[PDB]
Amino acid sequence: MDVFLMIRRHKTTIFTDAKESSTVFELKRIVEGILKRPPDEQRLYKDDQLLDDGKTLGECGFTSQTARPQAPATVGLAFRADDTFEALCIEPFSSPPELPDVMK
Amino acid sequence: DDLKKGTQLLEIYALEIQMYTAQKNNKKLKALYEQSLHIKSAIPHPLIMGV
Amino acid sequence: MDGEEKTYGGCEGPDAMYVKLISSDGHEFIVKREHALTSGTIKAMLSGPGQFAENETNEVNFREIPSHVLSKVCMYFTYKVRYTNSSTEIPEFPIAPEIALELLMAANFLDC
Amino acid sequence: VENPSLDLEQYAASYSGLMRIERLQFIADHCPTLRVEALKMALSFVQRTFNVDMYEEIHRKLSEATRSSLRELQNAPDAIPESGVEPPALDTAWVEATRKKALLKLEKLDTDLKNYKGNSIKESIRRGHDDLGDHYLDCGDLSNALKCYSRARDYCTSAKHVINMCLNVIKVSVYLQNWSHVLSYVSKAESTPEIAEQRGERDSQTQAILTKLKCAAGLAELAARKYKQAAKCLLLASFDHCDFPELLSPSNVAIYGGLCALATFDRQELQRNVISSSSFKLFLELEPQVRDIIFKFYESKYASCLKMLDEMKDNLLLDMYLAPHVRTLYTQIRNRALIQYFSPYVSADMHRMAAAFNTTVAALEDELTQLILEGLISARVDSHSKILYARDVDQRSTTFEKSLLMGKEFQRRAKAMMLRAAVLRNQIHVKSP
């Protein structure tokens, strides 16, 4: 039923819970109370694509099999550095270290 | 605990039993028998008690 | 489109509603407060340190856990809390061979 | 076989969701006469709350019954739905309209659920879980329906909230073939309300609570081939619920419990269970064809009790769950009637038994072979005179020899145990591998 998403922006993930087919404007109000920023400055993206305020999460592609609690989906974040978007690309996680060869 | 002879709640249910027995409807006679136990615990021994 | 939404609802909270977890590569893992109560070392930091339990400055510094290890730890906290107090299907958790050897050492440290 | 005489109004108004569609498709695939009315009523249910998984499967069977000339449905449909009634067809602009309308209803219910959680109201959250659980069933999300009912368990505060929640998990566990989960949930729903409230639902009762908990468990016990446990719980339910919106019909509990106890109980046990109990008398009075079976079985009337069994077999085969049980329950009732009939006899004639069961001499000889190996009797077939004789051994022969064989194994196993304990004394363990 419930789906979990992560808002990553320049090596900074934000774990925020939302509904399956909820409005996009409702998700921006939750980040306002944690970042002390107006919701009009944030911009949610999905696979390098600008979303709309009139649409919902269920119409884009936020299903139960995709945004599972065990493996959430990456959500883009873009602020307002001047008048347009700011961030767009993030950085992946690090690589695992060398495994001990004495155990294999 | 004074005078008796005067029951209305049990007289209505007793009149339906004499009518439903002619139509052979055991589904309604079983429901009317359970409702007669509450009134039987508050009446002496008149004539409706034997019906 | 349709449907009535709530402006100040859901899981909206101040600085005391979400915690902060500092990784070893510079990543900042900000999760909920109820999800960090599964472990033992993280829960001990919120009860202390210290005579100030709540001060809008709660943070977790992990110098031994990098970024790829804490990425599965935060997902394991949500998987453990959500899949309780119910009776539904529980899918299998995808665990990599290179991560299983690292997740075992982190589970014993976090007491989970 | 199939039966053209069957009431489809009561069989479709008893269940809802996926059970109403599956029960109607099995009738059309088995009965050629009841195929147009079965597919028409099933297509009308797709209009309310549209979907995309159950709208393309129903139309697949309609095109194979009207366009194909191999079936009898050709002179009336003429390979076109324009024949008397106008069922919903399937075109290009219909596969897209049935998907956009279903997704619009999901976004409206999901948005309202987030607002109810922010108001800190446990009554609005529990009410919204029932609407989301039944919506994902008709669409095709079998895993999303169990996630909505499982979250409503923490918002209970009364006895009616636990009963309404436990009844929803049974509907999802039926499609998943989880018979063990149904038996584990009916026990929890019986200890909280203490069996029909704490006083019996005031004085008069219109919809009994015990009947709901006793009817949902009978469907899972029948599919698991458990006729002994299903016939012992269906007798406690009474006819006081007036049909069901999402459960079995009241005209099927008398057959489910009447046919299960007829194969596991004899004649003496039937007069004390399905006859002495006043709760099962209300269910048997609705269908007089089932009450005459018990009376004919007690009066040693196996000739008339067998002819009435095959007459109702064509009507029970049109069902979905009772259809696969016509080959396991019918063979046990016929075998039980033959054992009880041969108990007072000891030298029955083959010519008299063949004329009583409406059979012949050739079919009667084959029935005696399957009655000795499978049954618990002891008869002998004498082919020299065509008379079922009886030749049993002495009571002292099968008792002295059985006790002597057990005494020899008792002394052999006791002496062999001393040999195993002998090597365990001088420090000699296992050294073979």
XYZ file of C-alpha atoms in Angstrom:
700
model
C 0.000 0.000 0.000
C 2.401 2.671 1.238
C 5.510 3.465 -0.802
C 8.802 5.011 0.302
C 10.958 7.356 -1.776
C 14.370 8.979 -1.367
C 15.169 12.558 -2.402
C 18.873 12.714 -3.276
C 20.605 15.997 -4.113
C 24.422 16.251 -4.231
C 25.232 13.288 -1.966
C 22.357 14.147 0.389
C 19.414 11.740 0.532
C 16.060 12.602 2.118
C 13.833 9.727 3.263
C 10.188 10.803 2.978
C 7.095 8.597 3.093
C 4.104 9.267 0.847
C 1.079 7.515 -0.619
C 0.955 5.478 -3.820
C -1.231 7.813 -5.894
C -1.055 11.109 -3.989
C -0.687 14.652 -5.279
C 2.761 16.010 -6.088
C 2.085 19.222 -4.146
C 1.498 17.269 -0.922
C 5.008 15.785 -1.030
C 6.639 19.228 -1.204
C 4.887 20.348 1.994
C 6.639 17.649 4.041
C 10.117 18.798 2.991
C 9.209 22.367 3.989
C 9.038 21.492 7.692
C 12.428 19.750 7.605
C 14.435 22.096 5.333
C 12.823 25.456 6.262
C 12.431 26.296 2.568
C 9.361 27.381 0.593
C 7.748 24.634 -1.511
C 7.674 26.817 -4.639
C 11.484 26.680 -4.885
C 11.679 22.872 -4.971
C 11.264 20.898 -8.198
C 10.609 17.150 -8.218
C 11.946 15.126 -11.146
C 11.499 11.530 -12.312
C 14.203 10.095 -14.603
C 15.159 13.562 -15.895
C 11.606 14.771 -16.491
C 9.780 17.756 -15.015
C 6.544 16.850 -13.237
C 3.290 18.803 -13.022
C 1.383 20.020 -9.976
C -2.007 18.973 -11.363
C -0.928 15.352 -11.815
C -0.398 12.705 -9.126
C 2.249 10.120 -8.277
C 0.118 7.221 -9.530
C -0.105 8.681 -13.038
C 3.670 9.054 -13.480
C 5.016 5.663 -12.412
C 5.090 5.393 -8.610
C 3.605 1.932 -8.045
C 3.928 -0.560 -5.202
C 6.291 -2.856 -7.133
C 8.645 0.035 -8.013
C 8.872 2.166 -4.843
C 9.123 -0.774 -2.471
C 10.219 -0.115 1.133
C 13.163 -2.494 0.659
C 14.338 -0.675 -2.498
C 13.074 2.887 -2.982
C 13.281 4.929 -6.168
C 15.514 7.943 -6.738
C 13.682 11.287 -6.781
C 15.402 14.312 -8.278
C 15.562 17.662 -6.502
C 16.189 21.109 -7.991
C 16.226 24.408 -6.101
C 16.318 27.991 -7.444
C 19.835 29.386 -7.802
C 18.545 32.377 -9.792
C 15.372 31.724 -11.799
C 15.758 28.209 -13.230
C 16.639 24.804 -11.800
C 19.880 24.175 -9.922
C 20.809 20.532 -9.327
C 19.951 17.714 -11.723
C 22.637 15.023 -11.426
C 23.736 13.262 -8.238
C 26.614 10.985 -7.226
C 26.249 7.212 -6.701
C 27.431 5.359 -3.626
C 30.967 4.096 -3.090
C 32.330 0.686 -4.096
C 32.763 -2.199 -1.643
C 36.327 -2.761 -0.399
C 38.563 -5.721 -1.214
C 37.113 -8.941 0.180
C 39.424 -11.203 2.224
C 40.783 -13.903 -0.075
C 41.505 -16.239 2.859
C 37.780 -16.921 3.325
C 37.045 -17.811 -0.313
C -47.782 -7.686 43.073
C -51.527 -6.992 43.076
C -54.193 -7.918 40.526
C -53.482 -9.996 37.427
C -55.445 -10.821 34.251
C -54.050 -8.432 31.645
C -51.189 -9.195 29.250
C -50.740 -7.573 25.829
C -47.154 -8.321 24.769
C -47.683 -12.088 25.080
C -51.248 -12.106 23.729
C -50.079 -10.744 20.366
C -47.379 -13.411 20.033
C -49.819 -16.135 21.112
C -52.329 -15.147 18.419
C -49.671 -15.558 15.717
C -48.839 -19.097 16.867
C -52.400 -20.350 16.354
C -52.314 -18.877 12.833
C -48.819 -19.966 11.760
C -49.481 -23.582 12.783
C -52.142 -23.889 10.069
C -49.629 -22.833 7.390
C -46.861 -25.201 8.614
C -44.120 -22.596 9.073
C -41.569 -23.840 11.612
C -39.159 -20.981 10.845
C -41.436 -18.449 12.568
C -42.646 -20.685 15.409
C -39.079 -21.178 16.656
C -38.436 -17.429 16.853
C -41.687 -16.778 18.735
C -40.868 -19.433 21.350
C -37.609 -17.735 22.360
C -39.345 -14.374 22.838
C -41.912 -15.961 25.176
C -39.258 -16.853 27.766
C -38.637 -13.217 28.728
C -42.329 -12.577 29.410
C -42.741 -15.909 31.229
C -40.208 -14.724 33.832
C -42.478 -11.813 34.828
C -46.037 -13.238 34.757
C -47.811 -15.425 37.357
C -49.982 -18.290 36.060
C -52.956 -17.012 34.038
C -54.354 -18.386 30.773
C -51.884 -16.992 28.221
C -49.092 -18.855 30.038
C -50.641 -22.150 28.925
C -50.785 -21.067 25.281
C -6.378 15.635 -10.125
C -9.279 14.576 -7.913
C -9.132 13.831 -4.201
C -8.780 16.005 -1.102
C -5.221 16.447 0.178
C -3.806 17.811 3.431
C -1.304 20.665 3.568
C 0.092 20.087 7.077
C -0.400 16.351 7.466
C 1.092 12.917 6.885
C 4.610 12.719 8.331
C 5.400 16.442 8.496
C 7.445 17.447 11.525
C 10.130 19.826 12.788
C 13.815 19.089 13.356
C 13.004 16.559 16.101
C 10.986 14.354 13.725
C 13.941 13.388 11.499
C 17.435 12.343 12.536
C 20.795 12.738 10.788
C 23.351 10.026 10.008
C 26.850 11.025 8.888
C 28.612 8.469 6.693
C 32.357 8.007 6.129
C 32.464 9.305 2.529
C 30.581 12.553 3.207
C 27.010 11.356 2.651
C 24.151 12.606 4.833
C 21.438 10.017 5.526
C 18.382 11.799 6.953
C 15.683 9.314 7.977
C 12.749 9.318 10.391
C 13.099 9.086 14.164
C 10.857 6.026 14.570
C 12.930 4.097 12.008
C 16.190 4.580 13.946
C 14.775 2.929 17.092
C 15.426 -0.578 15.731
C 19.168 -0.451 16.426
C 20.785 -0.120 19.837
C 23.690 2.250 19.252
C 21.592 4.884 17.469
C 18.815 4.696 20.071
C 21.368 5.191 22.858
C 22.419 8.525 21.337
C 18.884 9.944 21.425
C 18.375 8.993 25.080
C 21.564 10.795 26.107
C 24.160 12.035 25.580
C 23.846 13.993 27.871
C 21.058 15.677 29.832
C 19.418 17.017 26.635
C 17.294 14.333 24.980
C 15.701 16.698 22.436
C 17.464 19.808 21.144
C 16.956 19.905 17.327
C 20.644 18.973 16.954
C 20.439 15.170 16.900
C 23.060 13.595 14.636
C 24.813 10.246 14.213
C 28.503 10.076 13.268
C 29.660 6.721 11.864
C 33.368 6.706 10.993
C 33.479 2.945 10.299
C 30.424 2.629 8.011
C 30.847 4.118 4.502
C 28.044 4.978 2.067
C 27.180 1.693 0.330
C 26.847 -0.092 3.684
C 24.607 2.537 5.297
C 22.479 2.627 2.130
C 21.182 -0.885 2.841
C 20.996 -0.186 6.587
C 18.502 2.654 6.117
C 16.440 0.433 3.811
C 16.578 -2.375 6.385
C 15.142 -0.075 9.063
C 12.111 0.780 6.920
C 11.652 -2.881 5.968
C 11.735 -3.956 9.626
C 9.309 -1.335 10.955
C 6.753 -1.516 8.134
C 6.548 -5.332 8.073
C 5.401 -5.596 11.698
C 2.078 -5.427 13.554
C 0.367 -6.900 10.487
C -0.168 -10.184 8.617
C 0.741 -9.747 4.940
C 3.252 -11.192 2.492
C 6.923 -10.493 3.233
C 9.108 -10.497 0.084
C 12.754 -11.507 0.092
C 15.413 -8.858 0.680
C 17.992 -8.647 -2.153
C 21.407 -9.154 -0.544
C 24.604 -9.006 -2.588
C 27.487 -11.419 -1.887
C 29.957 -8.555 -1.379
C 27.505 -6.813 0.984
C 26.457 -9.845 3.071
C 29.944 -10.070 4.584
C 29.809 -6.352 5.435
C 26.199 -6.346 6.663
C 26.958 -9.053 9.240
C 29.547 -6.859 10.968
C 27.182 -3.869 10.948
C 24.299 -5.902 12.394
C 26.374 -6.947 15.412
C 27.492 -3.353 16.011
C 23.982 -1.877 15.758
C 22.593 -4.709 17.949
C 19.917 -5.609 15.400
C -23.365 -33.382 -16.655
C -24.669 -29.832 -16.992
C -28.205 -28.726 -16.147
C -30.169 -26.047 -18.050
C -32.367 -25.387 -14.978
C -30.327 -23.248 -12.581
C -31.054 -19.971 -10.785
C -28.338 -17.457 -11.688
C -29.782 -14.542 -9.691
C -28.986 -16.049 -6.282
C -25.637 -17.558 -7.311
C -24.340 -14.169 -8.512
C -25.717 -11.936 -5.734
C -24.025 -14.000 -2.996
C -20.376 -13.099 -3.702
C -18.598 -10.082 -5.174
C -15.270 -9.130 -6.693
C -13.307 -11.947 -8.298
C -15.548 -14.666 -6.839
C -18.613 -13.384 -8.709
C -16.799 -13.428 -12.059
C -15.149 -16.825 -11.548
C -18.435 -18.429 -10.472
C -20.199 -17.152 -13.607
C -17.473 -18.176 -16.071
C -17.436 -21.790 -14.858
C -21.160 -22.141 -15.599
C -20.866 -20.871 -19.178
C -17.867 -23.126 -19.870
C -19.771 -26.195 -18.612
C -23.404 -25.500 -19.578
C -23.978 -24.619 -23.255
C -27.576 -23.513 -22.646
C -26.673 -21.214 -19.725
C -23.832 -19.465 -21.576
C -25.419 -16.264 -22.909
C -27.013 -15.291 -19.592
C -23.830 -16.180 -17.692
C -21.576 -13.976 -19.830
C -24.099 -11.120 -19.934
C -24.442 -10.848 -16.151
C -20.663 -11.102 -15.731
C -20.053 -8.231 -18.163
C -22.496 -5.998 -16.273
C -20.355 -6.228 -13.126
C -17.329 -4.797 -14.958
C -19.182 -1.510 -15.526
C -19.128 -0.728 -11.803
C -15.483 -0.044 -10.889
C -13.752 -0.601 -14.229
C -10.606 -2.690 -14.637
C -8.260 -4.068 -17.287
C -7.568 -7.693 -16.253
C -11.145 -9.014 -16.033
C -12.432 -7.048 -19.042
C -10.310 -8.858 -21.649
C -10.781 -12.405 -20.321
C -14.592 -12.423 -20.431
C -14.702 -11.221 -24.046
C -12.306 -14.005 -25.079
C -14.956 -16.642 -24.317
C -17.765 -14.745 -26.069
C -15.936 -14.654 -29.410
C -15.282 -18.411 -29.271
C -18.958 -19.235 -28.612
C -20.634 -17.076 -31.293
C -18.180 -16.951 -34.210
C -17.270 -20.645 -34.009
C -19.689 -22.992 -35.774
C -18.635 -26.053 -33.742
C -21.067 -25.190 -30.916
C -24.852 -24.985 -30.784
C -24.760 -21.195 -30.241
C -24.880 -20.100 -33.879
C -28.505 -19.882 -35.021
C -29.308 -17.271 -32.349
C -26.141 -15.146 -31.909
C -25.199 -15.287 -35.623
C -21.598 -14.378 -34.703
C -22.665 -10.943 -33.434
C -23.684 -9.628 -29.976
C -26.752 -7.990 -31.593
C -29.159 -10.760 -30.568
C -31.890 -9.722 -28.144
C -29.629 -8.297 -25.448
C -26.717 -5.906 -26.044
C -23.730 -6.996 -23.924
C -20.715 -4.667 -23.674
C -18.487 -5.418 -26.654
C -14.728 -4.847 -26.994
C -13.300 -2.380 -29.510
C -10.309 -0.062 -29.917
C -11.669 2.866 -27.872
C -12.696 0.530 -25.022
C -9.381 -0.917 -23.811
C -8.172 2.632 -23.103
C -11.376 3.895 -21.468
C -11.450 0.946 -19.047
C -7.887 1.767 -17.906
C -8.024 5.560 -17.556
C -11.269 5.431 -15.562
C -9.886 2.792 -13.184
C -6.702 4.795 -12.578
C -8.686 7.974 -11.880
C -10.588 6.267 -9.057
C -7.306 5.063 -7.537
C -5.808 8.565 -7.402
C -8.909 9.950 -5.673
C -8.954 7.272 -2.963
C -5.189 7.428 -2.374
C -5.251 11.218 -1.977
C -8.095 11.074 0.556
C -6.242 8.440 2.601
C -3.324 10.805 3.254
C -5.700 13.490 4.548
C -7.408 11.081 6.959
C -4.061 10.119 8.508
C -3.167 13.744 9.266
C -6.428 14.375 11.135
C -5.573 11.767 13.822
C -8.911 9.999 13.308
C -8.879 6.217 13.692
C -12.422 5.926 12.305
C -11.662 7.517 8.927
C -8.558 5.366 8.407
C -10.323 2.063 9.103
C -13.199 3.021 6.792
C -10.811 3.870 3.953
C -9.019 0.527 4.236
C -12.150 -1.404 3.236
C -12.650 0.674 0.081
C -9.031 0.200 -1.025
C -8.988 -3.541 -0.341
C -11.999 -4.279 -2.545
C -10.767 -1.946 -5.303
C -7.459 -3.763 -5.866
C -9.217 -7.142 -6.134
C -11.167 -6.434 -9.331
C -8.252 -4.560 -10.925
C -5.737 -7.395 -10.619
C -3.505 -6.395 -7.696
C -3.759 -9.467 -5.481
C -0.819 -8.362 -3.318
C -2.060 -4.793 -2.798
C -5.348 -5.977 -1.270
C -3.619 -7.719 1.646
C -1.582 -4.616 2.509
C -4.697 -2.498 3.094
C -6.488 -4.971 5.372
C -3.343 -5.664 7.410
C -2.910 -1.976 8.283
C -6.455 -1.708 9.689
C -5.708 -4.087 12.582
C -4.044 -1.334 14.637
C -7.130 0.928 14.409
C -9.532 -1.343 16.315
C -11.310 -0.442 19.548
C -14.500 -2.525 19.464
C -15.538 -6.112 18.805
C -17.095 -5.229 15.437
C -13.770 -3.934 14.086
C -12.010 -7.276 14.602
C -14.811 -9.281 12.969
C -14.982 -7.010 9.916
C -11.187 -7.084 9.553
C -10.788 -10.855 9.938
C -13.510 -11.474 7.343
C -11.573 -9.475 4.738
C -8.377 -11.523 5.107
C -10.319 -14.741 4.462
C -11.465 -13.457 1.062
C -7.869 -12.795 -0.010
C -6.569 -16.070 1.457
C -9.061 -18.054 -0.644
C -7.561 -16.943 -3.966
C -4.055 -17.644 -2.617
C -5.016 -21.239 -1.671
C -4.038 -20.614 1.967
C -6.344 -22.998 3.817
C -4.120 -22.987 6.916
C -4.550 -19.224 7.377
C -8.359 -19.458 7.327
C -8.488 -21.957 10.199
C -6.107 -19.758 12.215
C -8.308 -16.657 11.813
C -11.727 -18.132 12.642
C -10.535 -18.952 16.167
C -9.510 -15.351 16.875
C -12.864 -14.027 15.621
C -14.723 -16.330 18.047
C -12.995 -15.431 21.334
C -13.298 -11.634 21.126
C -17.121 -11.341 20.788
C -17.638 -14.392 23.060
C -19.958 -16.015 20.485
C -22.694 -13.569 19.395
C -21.936 -10.651 21.716
C -22.281 -10.926 25.506
C -26.085 -11.238 25.676
C -27.086 -12.564 22.263
C -27.692 -9.366 20.240
C -30.489 -8.005 22.465
C -33.689 -10.104 22.222
C -34.609 -10.747 18.590
C -31.792 -11.380 16.111
C -31.910 -10.440 12.421
C -28.335 -11.250 11.313
C -26.515 -13.739 13.533
C -22.787 -13.266 14.060
C -22.039 -16.962 14.657
C -23.424 -17.812 11.209
C -20.831 -15.566 9.543
C -17.916 -17.226 11.345
C -19.317 -20.717 10.695
C -19.946 -20.191 6.964
C -16.538 -18.758 6.034
C -14.677 -21.699 7.594
C -16.784 -24.292 5.769
C -15.484 -23.229 2.361
C -11.825 -23.694 3.314
C -12.447 -27.060 4.991
C -14.340 -28.444 1.986
C -11.620 -27.569 -0.537
C -8.974 -29.250 1.655
C -10.797 -32.624 1.487
C -11.741 -32.413 5.176
C -15.305 -33.738 5.232
C -14.988 -34.844 8.871
C -14.225 -31.396 10.309
C -16.523 -29.502 7.929
C -19.595 -31.575 8.848
C -19.077 -31.006 12.592
C -19.153 -27.185 12.523
C -21.902 -26.469 9.969
C -24.564 -27.895 12.309
C -24.155 -25.093 14.873
C -25.213 -22.349 12.437
C -28.835 -21.211 12.221
C -30.853 -19.711 9.364
C -30.756 -16.109 10.564
C -28.709 -13.847 8.284
C -30.828 -13.322 5.146
C -28.410 -14.212 2.321
C -24.896 -12.738 2.259
C -23.249 -9.834 0.394
C -19.842 -11.513 0.119
C -20.194 -15.095 1.373
C -21.863 -18.395 0.503
C -25.575 -18.549 -0.222
C -27.910 -19.948 2.472
C -29.128 -22.582 -0.021
C -25.676 -24.223 -0.189
C -24.804 -24.764 3.488
C -27.426 -27.514 3.779
C -25.850 -29.375 0.854
C -22.267 -28.764 2.016
C -22.993 -30.178 5.472
C -25.575 -32.725 4.381
C -23.303 -34.486 1.887
C -20.207 -34.418 4.111
C -21.871 -36.066 7.118
C -23.600 -38.640 4.894
C -20.253 -40.262 4.015
C -18.535 -40.179 7.431
C -21.501 -41.011 9.703
C -23.887 -43.963 9.792
C -27.658 -43.928 10.381
C -27.520 -43.644 14.180
C -25.169 -40.639 14.121
C -27.379 -38.729 11.663
C -30.437 -38.833 13.938
C -28.382 -37.247 16.746
C -26.471 -34.611 14.745
C -28.436 -33.261 11.764
C -31.822 -34.230 13.272
C -31.641 -33.709 17.041
C -29.992 -30.286 16.701
C -32.525 -27.499 16.183
C -29.934 -25.229 14.544
C -29.569 -27.441 11.457
C -33.332 -27.998 11.136
C -33.902 -24.477 9.790
C -31.422 -25.028 6.947
C -32.862 -28.416 5.946
C -36.446 -27.106 5.882
C -35.673 -24.701 3.023
C -34.693 -27.539 0.657
C -37.017 -30.554 1.111
C -34.876 -32.618 -1.285
C -32.098 -32.844 1.319
C -34.258 -33.747 4.335
C -35.732 -36.814 2.612
C -32.235 -38.283 2.196
C -31.748 -38.685 5.953
C -35.192 -40.248 6.411
C -34.656 -42.695 3.541
C -31.255 -43.706 4.943
C -32.692 -44.629 8.360
C -35.644 -46.693 7.077
C -33.305 -49.033 5.129
C -34.565 -47.570 1.840
C -31.380 -47.646 -0.227
C -33.332 -48.116 -3.476
C -35.086 -44.732 -3.412
C -32.208 -42.904 -1.700
C -29.844 -43.676 -4.589
C -32.139 -42.462 -7.383
C -32.547 -39.064 -5.708
C -28.767 -38.663 -5.373
C -28.062 -38.753 -9.119
C -30.972 -36.409 -9.886
C -29.320 -33.509 -8.026
C -25.811 -34.321 -9.290
C -26.362 -32.328 -12.492
C -27.165 -29.181 -10.494
C -24.155 -29.492 -8.170
C -21.725 -29.995 -11.071
C -22.418 -26.457 -12.333
C -20.636 -24.978 -9.296
C -16.923 -24.149 -9.089
C -15.826 -25.599 -5.732
C -18.336 -28.456 -5.401
C -17.653 -29.699 -8.945
C -14.238 -31.339 -8.242
C -15.761 -32.985 -5.136
C -18.314 -35.094 -7.053
C -15.830 -37.954 -7.583
C -14.590 -38.265 -3.984
C -17.782 -37.755 -1.960
C -20.099 -39.831 -4.167
C -17.881 -42.928 -3.993
C -17.867 -42.764 -0.177
C -21.650 -42.495 0.228
C -22.296 -45.493 -2.032
C -19.640 -47.505 -0.186
C -21.123 -46.570 3.198
C -24.652 -47.604 2.194
C -23.427 -51.049 1.114
C -21.653 -51.737 4.418
C -24.657 -50.763 6.546
C -26.934 -52.910 4.367
C -24.747 -56.028 4.656
C -24.430 -55.707 8.448
C -27.749 -57.453 9.314
C -27.270 -59.955 6.470
C -24.590 -62.630 6.055
C -25.774 -64.516 2.951
C -27.211 -61.982 0.509
C -28.377 -63.111 -2.923
C -26.916 -61.536 -6.051
C -30.258 -61.733 -7.873
C -32.052 -59.743 -5.159
C -29.356 -57.068 -4.811
C -29.169 -56.433 -8.565
C -32.905 -55.705 -8.834
C -32.927 -53.398 -5.796
C -30.163 -51.050 -6.994
C -31.629 -50.835 -10.536
C -28.671 -52.782 -11.935
C -27.998 -56.145 -13.609
C -26.218 -59.393 -12.778
C -23.105 -58.318 -14.695
C -22.783 -55.011 -12.824
C -23.521 -56.569 -9.418
C -20.565 -58.972 -9.586
C -18.136 -56.110 -10.244
C -19.448 -54.171 -7.230
C -18.639 -57.012 -4.816
C -14.950 -56.989 -5.788
C -14.512 -53.325 -4.815
C -16.494 -53.842 -1.587
C -14.121 -56.319 0.092
C -10.750 -54.656 -0.535
C -12.012 -51.109 0.088
C -14.765 -51.879 2.601
C -14.499 -53.256 6.123
C -16.859 -56.228 5.669
C -15.980 -59.901 5.116
C -18.029 -61.569 2.374
C -17.311 -64.416 -0.042
C -18.464 -64.510 -3.667
C -19.641 -68.012 -4.620
C -19.638 -68.203 -8.421
C -21.025 -71.759 -8.379
C -24.475 -70.523 -7.306
C -24.251 -66.707 -7.716
C -24.878 -66.232 -3.981
C -22.699 -63.976 -1.818
C -21.776 -66.418 0.949
C -19.570 -65.848 4.007
C -16.560 -67.856 5.212
C -14.744 -66.427 8.240
C -11.949 -67.952 10.309
C -12.280 -68.887 13.976
C -11.917 -66.259 16.687
C -9.213 -68.321 18.415
C -7.166 -68.728 15.220
C -6.686 -65.023 14.436
C -6.043 -64.227 18.127
C -3.602 -66.937 19.237
C -1.487 -66.610 16.081
C -1.358 -62.803 16.226
C -0.307 -62.845 19.886
C 2.310 -65.536 19.227
C 3.872 -63.545 16.376
C 4.075 -60.466 18.606
C 5.632 -62.484 21.429
C 8.388 -63.741 19.133
C 9.247 -60.198 18.032
C 9.153 -59.046 21.664
C 11.822 -61.564 22.689
C 13.887 -60.987 19.537
C 13.956 -57.203 19.964
C 14.756 -57.503 23.679
C 17.658 -59.902 23.105
C 18.969 -57.795 20.213
C 18.989 -54.733 22.482
C 21.392 -56.485 24.866
C 23.811 -57.020 21.971
C 23.833 -53.286 21.212
C 24.368 -52.423 24.888
C 27.125 -55.039 25.244
C 29.599 -53.202 23.003
C 28.749 -49.926 24.776
C 30.281 -51.263 28.017
C 33.842 -52.181 26.951
C 34.321 -48.767 25.259
C 33.445 -49.826 21.705
C 31.547 -47.179 19.729
C 30.878 -46.721 16.003
C 34.041 -47.260 13.943
C 32.619 -48.381 10.577
C 32.718 -45.084 8.658
